[PDB]
C-alpha cells in the first residue's frame, strides 16, 4: 500500500502509543499474574493432587512478560523514528527479531486464553476431592507430614468466611479432635466410640473457625443438633453462629471469577499485541523502500507480505 | 412457623412386594431441602436407608439395601417418594422421613444432622 510521508508519520506515532498500550497491559496481567500465584501459594493443599490449575498462572506470566518485549520493542520503534539514522543498526536483527517476537507472543497468549478457557472447568471436582482430604486430615495435627492441615484449614475457614465444603451440619460426621487428647475416663466418650464403626469419633459440633463475627450471641460450638440445648437457638435457620455458605462455593466463585477476570485481560491483550505487531511489520515493510530515511518521499508501498502468497506457498 | 412432615402409604406387604411411601413437607422452598429417610424396627436403632439432595442427580442407599431401593423427588408437588422393590420381612420397621436446610458436602447422611422430623409410617412384611 503506498504510503505517503505524513501518514507514516501519524501512523509511527500511533504505533508508538499502541506499543506504551500494551507495555502497560503486560505489566498489569504480570501483577495479576502474580497475584494469582501468591494465592494460590496458601491455596495449593485444598487442591486435588491432580488438578493442573496453577499451571495457568505459569503461563500466564510468560505471555506477560512476551507482551511487554513487544511493547518495549515497539518503543524502541518509536525511538527508531525518531532517529531515522539509529535505525540502520537495528535494521537487520528487526526482521527476525519481529518474526520470533511475532511467534512467541502468539503461541503463549493462545496457550494462555486455552488454559483460562479450560482448566476452570476441573476446579469443581479438584476442590471436591481436595477440600474433602484436608478435612480427613484435619484431626491428625499431630502426624508428621499433615500437621499444616489443622492451620491452613483454620486460616481459610476464617478468611474466606466458610464452613466446610458446602455448609457445617454433617462436619458433625467427620472427627476433627485428635483422640490423643480424648479422655478414656469419659463413659460418654467410650459409649460414642463404640457405638460408632471404625472407631471414630463423632460430635455435634464444628471447630472455632467456623464461627461467624456477624453473630450477636457467642458462638456456640457443641450441641448443635439440639433446639433446647441454649436459650434461644433452633433448628430454623440462625443468622448468628456458624457461617451460611461453604468453602468449596466460595472458593470456586472467587477462583472462577480470578480465571474470567485474567481470560479477559489475555484476551485484549492478544487483540492489541496482534494490533502493535501489524503495525510494526507495516512500518518496516514500508520504510524497507525509503532505506530507513523518514525524510524520503518516495511513496513506499506496505504489504504484510514481503511479495505473493502463491510465492511463500511455493517456497514451502 | 415450625415446618410440618406427614409420610403416607405404610401398610401391610408379602415378601418380595413393592411398595410407595411419600413424605410430604409445608414450606415452598422444599427445593433446597436436603432430605433422608430412615428405618428403626424394635430390637435395632435408627438407620439410614436412602438419601436425596439439592442437584436432584445424587442418590446414596445403604449397602445393604444399595440398588433394591429407589428415592426420587418431585419439586411441583414438594414430595420425596420412595419406592420399596424385593422387599424381605426383616425390612419390617417404622419409616421417618427427614428434611434439613442446605448440607451439600457430605451426600451420606445420619441423624445427627437432619431438623424436621415427620412422625413417620409402619410398614410390616410378611412371607
Known amino acids: 500500500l503506498v504510503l505517503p510521508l505524513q501518514p507514516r508519520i501519524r501512523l509511527a506515532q500511533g504505533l508508538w502509543l499502541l506499543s506504551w498500550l500494551l507495555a502497560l497491559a503486560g505489566g498489569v496481567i504480570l501483577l495479576c499474574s502474580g497475584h494469582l500465584l501468591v494465592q494460590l501459594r496458601h491455596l495449593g493443599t485444598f487442591l486435588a493432587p491432580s488438578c493442573q490449575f496453577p499451571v495457568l498462572p505459569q503461563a500466564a506470566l510468560a505471555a506477560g512478560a512476551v507482551a511487554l518485549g513487544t511493547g518495549l520493542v515497539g518503543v524502541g520503534a518509536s525511538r527508531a523514528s525518531l532517529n531515522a539514522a539509529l535505525y540502520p543498526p537495528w535494521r537487520g536483527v528487526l526482521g527476525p527479531l519481529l518474526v520470533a517476537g511475532t511467534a512467541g507472543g502468539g503461541g503463549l497468549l493462545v496457550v494462555g486464553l486455552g488454559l483460562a478457557l479450560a482448566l476452570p472447568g476441573s476446579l469443581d471436582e479438584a476442590l471436591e476431592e481436595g477440600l474433602v482430604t484436608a478435612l480427613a486430615h484435619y484431626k491428625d495435627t499431630e502426624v508428621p507430614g499433615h500437621c499444616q492441615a489443622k492451620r491452613l484449614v483454620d486460616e481459610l475457614q476464617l478468611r474466606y468466611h466458610c464452613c466446610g465444603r458446602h455448609g457445617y451440619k454433617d462436619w458433625f460426621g467427620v472427627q476433627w479432635v485428635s483422640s490423643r487428647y480424648l479422655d478414656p475416663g469419659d463413659r460418654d466418650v467410650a459409649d460414642r466410640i463404640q457405638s460408632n464403626v471404625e472407631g471414630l469419633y463423632l460430635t455435634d459440633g464444628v471447630p472455632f473457625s467456623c464461627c461467624n463475627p456477624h453473630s450477636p450471641r457467642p458462638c456456640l460450638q457443641n450441641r448443635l443438633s439440639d433446639s433446647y440445648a441454649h436459650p434461644l437457638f433452633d433448628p430454623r435457620q440462625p443468622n448468628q453462629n456458624l457461617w451460611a455458605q461453604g468453602c468449596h462455593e466460595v472458593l470456586l466463585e472467587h477462583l472462577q471469577d480470578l480465571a474470567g477476570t485474567l481470560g479477559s485481560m489475555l484476551a485484549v491483550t492478544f487483540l492489541l499485541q496482534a494490533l502493535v505487531l501489524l503495525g510494526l511489520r507495516y512500518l518496516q515493510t514500508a520504510l524497507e523502500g525509503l532505506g530507513g530515511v523518514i525524510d524520503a518521499g518516495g511513496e513506499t508501498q506496505g504489504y504484510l507480505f514481503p511479495s505473493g502468497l502463491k510465492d511463500m506457498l511455493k517456497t514451502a | 412457623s415450625q415446618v410440618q412432615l406427614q409420610e403416607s402409604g405404610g401398610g401391610l406387604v408379602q415378601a418380595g412386594g413393592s411398595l410407595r411411601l411419600s413424605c410430604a413437607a409445608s414450606?415452598?422452598?422444599?427445593?433446597?431441602?436436603?432430605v433422608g429417610w430412615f428405618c428403626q424396627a424394635p430390637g435395632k436403632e435408627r438407620e439410614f436407608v436412602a438419601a436425596?439432595?439439592?442437584?436432584?442427580?445424587?442418590?446414596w442407599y445403604a449397602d445393604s439395601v444399595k440398588g433394591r431401593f429407589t428415592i426420587s423427588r418431585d419439586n411441583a408437588k414438594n414430595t420425596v417418594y420412595l419406592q420399596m422393590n424385593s422387599l424381605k420381612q426383616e425390612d419390617t420397621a417404622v419409616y421417618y422421613c427427614?428434611?434439613?436446610?442446605?448440607?451439600?458436602?457430605?451426600?451420606?447422611?445420619?441423624?445427627?444432622?437432619?431438623?424436621?422430623w415427620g412422625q413417620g409410617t409402619q410398614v410390616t412384611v410378611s412371607s
Open positions: 427427614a428434611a434439613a436446610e442446605p448440607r451439600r458436602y457430605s451426600y451420606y447422611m445420619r441423624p445427627d444432622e437432619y431438623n424436621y
Open positions: 436425596v439432595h439439592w442437584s436432584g442427580g445424587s442418590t
Open positions: 414450606t415452598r422452598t422444599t427445593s433446597r431441602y436436603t
